[PDB]
């Protein structure tokens, strides 16, 4: 007999955004019923769907055949499509509020006592992670005070239990890498992980984002299968928000206000640029101006004025970046690459 049962937990269900650019715009997931009225999914899968949670309406299809259900779960599984077929780069990766949280967590300033570290570790012990041992790592500093660094807490995500065969290893350069330290950068931007343990460096978009290769989740996918990468991503998505909320991350009007030295430098640069532009205008209008090759005199003047304005812009941006102090929320989000960049900071 045929029974038209309700949609229950475990049913393979297609989930799609109607504007489709690549094949990853539609994926087969596992349905879990919730009392609310919206389609909820992990934000790490937002990059394939290209969603932004500002009113997006998405479609949800239910196959009516066991063969179709199995084909959807196998071929269009979320764990089996972590990389795009265009260039092999992983699309399902960490996103905003996950890159910044992991970056602030893996900073060298982080030092957690036993209670806070235990809480942050237990924040992920839900679902299938309820049947594994915690494996609290040994503390780094113990004689003056027993403190657990944030890097060990982040590495716990990679290898939660003792019986977990995950042994992650990675050696790459970060966004703010100097180029000469070679794992001894003053900014500590050289990512080095041995045996699923973050030995050096701070996490950012270059290592946790969906930009290109050398991603830790990509390494886990290519070395230990899809399930381990999915579990690591779930642990990250369950750990980073908890620490980000318990620590506090806010932006204010004082985070974007200019300094006195910045104002003086901007004034001097504007004066110099305006003087040089007036000199160029006077040279072109009255007299002979050096004509650049491949263009006329007017185009030469346009190029020179654009060059001077760009000089003013970049010098003001460098002055603002130098005068800015650390822990600045725009600068912090620009360093980790979660959102924004130095150009937006200089403009604002």
């Amino acid at each position: 007999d045929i029974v038209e049962r309700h949609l229950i937990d475990g049913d393979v269900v297609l989930f799609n955004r109607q504007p489709s650019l690549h094949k990853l715009s539609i994926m087969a997931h596992l349905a879990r019923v919730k009392p609310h009225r919206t389609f909820r999914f992990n934000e790490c899968v937002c990059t394939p769907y290209n969603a932004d949670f500002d009113g997006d309406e998405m479609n949800l299809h239910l196959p009516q055949t066991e063969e179709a259900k199995a084909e959807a779960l196998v071929l269009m599984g979320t764990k089996a499509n972590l990389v795009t077929p265009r260039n092999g780069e992983p699309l399902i990766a960490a996103i905003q509020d996950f890159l910044t949280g992991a970056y602030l967590l893996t900073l060298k300033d982080t030092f957690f006592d036993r209670a806070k570290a235990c809480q942050i570790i237990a924040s992920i012990l839900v679902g299938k992670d309820e049947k594994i041992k915690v494996r609290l790592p040994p503390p780094t500093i113990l004689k003056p005070v027993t403190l657990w660094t944030g890097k060990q807490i982040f590495s716990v995500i990679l290898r939660p239990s003792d019986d977990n065969p995950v042994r992650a290893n990675l050696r790459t350069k970060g966004k703010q890498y100097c180029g000469k330290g070679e794992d001894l950068c003053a900014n500590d931007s050289y990512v080095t992980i041995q045996n699923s343990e973050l030995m050096s460096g701070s996490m950012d978009k270059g290592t946790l984002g969906s930009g290109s290769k050398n991603n830790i989740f990509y390494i886990l996918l290519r070395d230990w299968g899809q399930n381990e990468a999915a579990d690591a991503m779930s642990r990250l998505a369950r750990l980073a928000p908890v620490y980000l909320s318990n620590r506090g991350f806010s932006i204010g009007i004082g985070d974007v206000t200019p300094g006195q030295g910045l104002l003086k430098a901007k004034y001097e640069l504007l004066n110099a640029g305006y003087k040089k532009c007036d000199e160029y205008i006077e040279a072109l209008n009255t007299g002979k101006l050096q004509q650049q090759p491949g263009c006329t005199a007017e185009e030469t003047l346009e190029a020179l004025i654009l060059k001077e304005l760009s000089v003013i812009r970049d010098h003001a941006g460098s002055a603002c970046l130098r005068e800015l102090d650390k822990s600045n929320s725009p600068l912090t989000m620009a360093l980790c690459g979660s959102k924004g960049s130095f150009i937006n900071i200089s403009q604002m």
């Binding site: 609310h36 235990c118 237990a122 679902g127 309820e130 049947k131 041992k133 915690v134």
Partner: protein, 103 residues
Amino acid sequence: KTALEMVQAAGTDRHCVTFVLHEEDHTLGNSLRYMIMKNPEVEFCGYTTTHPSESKINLRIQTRGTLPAVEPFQRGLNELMNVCQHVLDKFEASIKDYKDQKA
């Protein structure tokens, strides 16, 4: 049906236990976490919320030696109850002497 115990695996190891507590929130979870973390025989204590929609919390206790991890739970509960009784008595006494000295 409110508080249920769960062993770490099928081996039924008493060192690592998980207590699932129903119709609770961060209040009692954090209070019991603080009251049992001071127990020297507790290696790992940690409470978490499964999902904000449902009202349940999961606490996990891992001891040092061969403690069943249920005795520290009862110890922390009794210590929290004693602390609550003491603070209640102290607050009542303070309010009473304030009312006395005010008049």
